[PDB]
């Protein structure tokens, strides 16, 4: 499970993850504090022990590893991705590979969060070498966006490698 939108993900107690804010669709530091899927077992004992699905197909409850104030917030397997630790170099940036990446939507020349995109185009010049991605927010999505921070694109992580 490497590039080309491998589409993986399986997280656990204190397995470091990135997570999407449902409000701007951004990816940031999130430490896992509970993996479970809300079935009180099967038919409601006051316990909430059992998970109906596999450790991949369940629910994840993060504590934002940079933002401790915003507390325990719950996201699903598709809307969390593990802590994207391995850099995608310039040469591996596949057109149509979904990545999470250095962009700010308020100032697109600047650094903000790791917004989720797919490579839409690649180009290089005498002075500058660039990426162009379809960027996705938690509402809208901005096509052929000027990717300035080339050195810190991240991909979908493993489930458990």
């Amino acid at each position: 499970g490497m590039w080309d939108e491998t589409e993986l993900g399986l997280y656990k107690v204190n397995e470091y993850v990135d997570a999407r804010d449902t409000n701007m669709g951004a990816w940031f530091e999130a430490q896992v504090v509970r993996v479970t899927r809300k079935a009180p077992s099967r038919d409601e004992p006051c316990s909430s022990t059992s998970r109906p699905a596999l450790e991949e197909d369940v629910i994840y409850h993060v504590k934002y590893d940079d933002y401790p104030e915003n507390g325990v917030v719950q996201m699903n397997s598709r809307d969390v991705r593990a802590r994207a630790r391995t850099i995608i170099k310039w040469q591996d940036l596949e057109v149509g590979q979904v990545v999470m990446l250095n962009y700010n939507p308020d100032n697109p020349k600047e650094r903000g969060f790791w917004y989720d995109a797919e490579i839409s185009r690649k180009r290089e010049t005498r002075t500058a070498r660039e990426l162009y991605a379809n960027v996705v927010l938690g509402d809208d999505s901005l096509n052929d966006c000027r990717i300035i921070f080339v050195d810190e694109v991240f991909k979908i992580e493993r489930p458990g490698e």
Binding site: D21, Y67, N70, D106, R111, G138, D151, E152
Partner: peptide, 11 residues
């Protein structure tokens, strides 16, 4: 370059 900072919330 090779570094990861966060900024702002809409939350």
């Amino acid at each position: 370059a090779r570094t990861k900072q966060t900024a702002r919330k809409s939350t």
